[PDB]
Write a protein that binds this ligand. Structure first.
Ligand SMILES: Nc1ncnc2c1ncn2[C@@H]1O[C@H](CSCC[C@H](N)C(=O)O)[C@@H](O)[C@H]1O
Ligand SMILES: Nc1ncnc2c1ncn2[C@@H]1O[C@H](CSCC[C@H](N)C(=O)O)[C@@H](O)[C@H]1O
Ligand SMILES: Nc1ncnc2c1ncn2[C@@H]1O[C@H](CSCC[C@H](N)C(=O)O)[C@@H](O)[C@H]1O
Ligand SMILES: Nc1ncnc2c1ncn2[C@@H]1O[C@H](CSCC[C@H](N)C(=O)O)[C@@H](O)[C@H]1O
Ligand SMILES: Nc1ncnc2c1ncn2[C@@H]1O[C@H](CSCC[C@H](N)C(=O)O)[C@@H](O)[C@H]1O
Lengths: 232, 227, 206, 226, 230, 194
């Protein structure tokens, strides 16, 4: 009766993330890594490992999949952002990804990660140039009052999905200049499904300051109808 | 002051039921233009279902499964962690009564303020308020008659509740059923999940008659096996 | 067989051990021809049809449901039971030229009536749902129902064979349905909510 | 007077990158009208990808595979066979550079005319003119450092180019990757393709970790097993 | 064993296959004589390659039955006295057109053109009303030496080489009102890969040629490539 | 009910679409496709996929007889006779059908087509050559007809095909031919020889 010798963690803590912030390359269970060429037709055509979140960057985990990466690439090339703000850092993968990418395009960009819990961050202390971390909860806006003068243009991204609309109002009133993005990843389609009448009303409240950018907005399952930018 | 839309994940934005309102078509299509009528549903299909004017979050396939399960087991108690609007509570009571079964339905939740069942229709339904994370929410329960079906719809602290139920509640043949979450937990944490479930190998089995019979019950229908 | 028998698993044990959870097969374990039921009687109405009928019953609150085509009576017991628990005073009536196959015992036979044969006597209370489940001679019965039976609001419903009639003879189907343009309409809240009632839910208009 | 439209098969009509254009919707959509906004990409998806303003014919899925492979292998050499606009060359040289890998990137093509890489942005990238019909092209690969990834993206004389790579170029753990074409060679020449591949059974295995990970690499990632 | 071979250029087989002769596909993972007790547990899948499995009289047919059904209608309606095919290969299509016009009682000459007739598998026994010409498509002389043809006429492009110049020729020197010029296969690919130039080139013939809408959406292979003289 | 063939007519779009508006043309079929297939101006209730399976079958088997329960307007019969004739096979095509009237096939096109009137064989059916294909296209009394053919008609190698009604217990003297069973939706699991 192994269960009574056992206490059980709560598995909800792994929703959208997984058991480990550390990256580990996948592993073939039911087949050799080296399939021989005489039997090439008989090889299995499926992936061989879980496609839940297999993506990485320089040995850090990456929760933004390749289609998303192509959109952010295009968006960086066009906008040439002076600042990027990730909300929800997790393991640090996409922070390093944004900083490395702006560096290669020759863009002088400051990458800023905010989070509840930076203990999960996996970025070498040496590989941290042009990056700044901030512990703080989205749930209360002082996390954003406290930080200051960011250069523009500016991309603000919500991967945390918490207090999102109050943060969006904070951003329009106190941060975003014309042409700056505010991107809500993953979540906007679910909120519409679960709460159509409230979701539409909330989005609509921003009818005069934010518009959805139809050039990037339909270009990845993750950014799906979530890519917004400042007007007026 | 924007409400936090996460609150509504899996539930909806209003516990009260309202019938679908057609938006780009009249209710009455003229038969001379029968073929040109749009063949799609017409409404939002997120949780369209009802039972006597109360919302139903269990879709029709799931309901078919429970009908069969109730018919075979003939449970004398049904317990639901997660009550919400009460739809499924009243359904269970209503169905067991139609089948002639003497069944108490008990419902447990940390917030009962959303319940929509009129007290005139509360016969054989017992609501208790508690948090899954406190185990006393369960130790406070009075003796229950068997067979019994324990259903997790709240998904918090689920495995320690399984440990509790195996040890203090379930007689052989009784069901501990986890709706919806098993496939997600397995996707997000495949190893931990496997080890956890497997730790119940001696006391619970997966019932294959039902475990593949509905999208919501999928791989979550479990029963107390002989010691 | 009209009698109901639970599904039997030929390739799986019913009790799959938890230590091998991931290895369990994901398909249903048996045929999905007609595995539905209601209190030990067979139900040919799949769960989506059940839901539409539930909804229909709840808003209309029918005084009379008439089922042309009975088979074994499970749908008849379902209508009666469901109308009882909603509080609706409803008379289920079931008409088939052959009734031998009917499994309902004479005890829970309250508010149910069987007639055998074609055409007759309706001093029956409205609102009414008429369900054509005997897929022969349909458009004739539809004219017959509009001339003798149907009042405003009342439904006439064609299960199963509607999309098949547009498949085989499309020109005639449309003409034959378009002949009732002035009397019946297609209720678009239910007419797309089930494969079995798909585009077969009609109701008297005026 | 009409050009041979077959020339553009797989490539496109201009090797320079032109950003996509929205055919029938404004770029800004009013947020009060969000539910009504269209849902499909909004332009042609044939080959809309890019790296630093140059076209990339490797899509994001292929890009992710190569990243993984490059992180693990840490190749001292990558040889693209068939160049076109040079997008891949620029990309590989960049990805290795960020990754702290000291990597040479060689492009080989009969036609280097359509290469769009500026001369300023050309460190660790060398280009060689030459035909796959003839093997002295590859013979002057001046024993570049290892490990090495060799990729076929032109597809002429490909099986002879492989017998050569095995005997004179490749070492244990080096890659030989045929993009796009292997599933087409198997559809069309089931018998012959299956003989030719497999004639290399003692010298090359298919690496299953990367071999089913994108459409373009599908059943095409091979490596030297000595 | 790799050193002990010289490999053919497998591109040679693009859209053709490796063998002009028809070989009937055989089952691999199962016998052909399944038992009737096990009728339920027999699989739904075809059981073979599905690439270009079709045939006519022991000759490989590269036009799939869907495309074949629409030519049957087109021949029946128009009743052509001449059918030109560019791209012959095994001669399957040639013999099919010939056999179908004949069974339909039409006096139709089929004419097949190709740079390489070595691959043709039609017995001479069954060569009636078939005229082959060897010539390269990117070479207007190939067409200039074509004798007079009776009308109506259906001209079909299966070689897809120098195609637009050939339409220009066909429009200037062959096609009378009613006649068809039909590009099979290539058109969708040409619109994925060169949408600007393809649109420009087609609109060049706007005044002389039209997309026949009764046939052009009707098979995968003819999809958007069926055209005729206004 | 219409046994005669009529070519589909368009509705919303012209037949002649301009090539300067080529990219904008409608990509859908433009008309219903219940069964708009003909052979030589006669309707025909074979998909092109079914047409191709039978073709392969006639070419391999080379039947000296084809029987066909249900005829309708005669397409199949003419088609079969024409196909065996083009293939040089000496085949007789028998069409059996209770309502013979529908048959549009004209007298001058009947060589190797014999029609018999009747309901589902039972007499007025004489000795015929093999190999034989037998086709049930009229799905009443289909199973008694199987045993009867199995006991009085089918020799080894001969087929018996059920056409349309086979998704909706004979292992000793029959078998399912797996080369053609899956190859078309209309013959889904209906192709059974010996
Ligand atoms: N209320 C809250 N306030 C701040 N951070 C929160 C939060 N709720 C969740 N989070 C954080 O949100 C993160 C989501 S994962 C972040 C994904 C990452 N930006 C990438 O794309 O690679 C977690 O690290 C979690 O700790
Ligand atoms: N820790 C916790 N303890 C008790 N209930 C909780 C909880 N966390 C969430 N819940 C409750 O879980 C419920 C689950 S939704 C219930 C589903 C519905 N009654 C059905 O039968 O299908 C919500 O009402 C929520 O209030
Ligand atoms: N016989 C041959 N010898 C050398 N190069 C050839 C060749 N045939 C075709 N090519 C070249 O092959 C190239 C194919 S496109 C190259 C694809 C691109 N490098 C990518 O990353 O996907 C063309 O540039 C063409 O010039
Ligand atoms: N330029 C050219 N001139 C004449 N024939 C050519 C040609 N290019 C290719 N062909 C020949 O014509 C055929 C065209 S390629 C094969 C076409 C095939 N029927 C299809 O549509 O997919 C081959 O038989 C080839 O030998
Ligand atoms: N029970 C029965 N006895 C004899 N004929 C029948 C029959 N049931 C249906 N039929 C006839 O069989 C025909 C079936 S339709 C036959 C279609 C034919 N194979 C084709 O492709 O063209 C109809 O003409 C109908 O009149």
């Amino acid at each position: 009766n192994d269960y009574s010798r056992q206490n059980f963690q709560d598995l909800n803590l792994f929703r959208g993330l997984g058991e480990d912030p550390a990256y580990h390359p996948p592993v073939l269970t039911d087949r050799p890594r080296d399939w021989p060429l005489d039997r090439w037709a008989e090889a299995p055509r499926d992936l061989g490992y879980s496609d839940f979140s297999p993506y990485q960057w320089r040995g850090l985990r990456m929760l933004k999949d390749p289609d998303t990466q192509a959109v952010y690439h295009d968006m960086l090339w066009e906008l040439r952002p002076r600042t990027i703000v990730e909300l929800g850092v997790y393991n640090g993968g996409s922070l390093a990804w944004f900083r490395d990418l702006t560096k290669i395009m020759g863009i002088d960009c400051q990458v800023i990660g905010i989070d509840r819990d930076l203990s999960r961050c996996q970025i070498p202390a040496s590989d941290m140039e042009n990056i700044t971390l901030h512990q703080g909860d989205c749930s209360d806006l002082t996390t954003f009052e406290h930080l200051r003068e960011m250069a523009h243009p500016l991309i603000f991204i919500d991967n945390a999905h918490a207090n999102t609309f109050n943060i969006m109002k904070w951003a329009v009133d106190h941060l975003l200049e014309e042409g700056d993005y505010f991107i809500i990843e993953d979540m906007i389609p679910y909120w519409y499904r679960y709460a159509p009448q409230l979701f539409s009303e909330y989005l609509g409240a921003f009818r005069d300051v934010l518009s959805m950018d139809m050039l990037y907005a339909n270009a990845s399952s993750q950014l799906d109808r979530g890519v917004l930018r400042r007007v007026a």
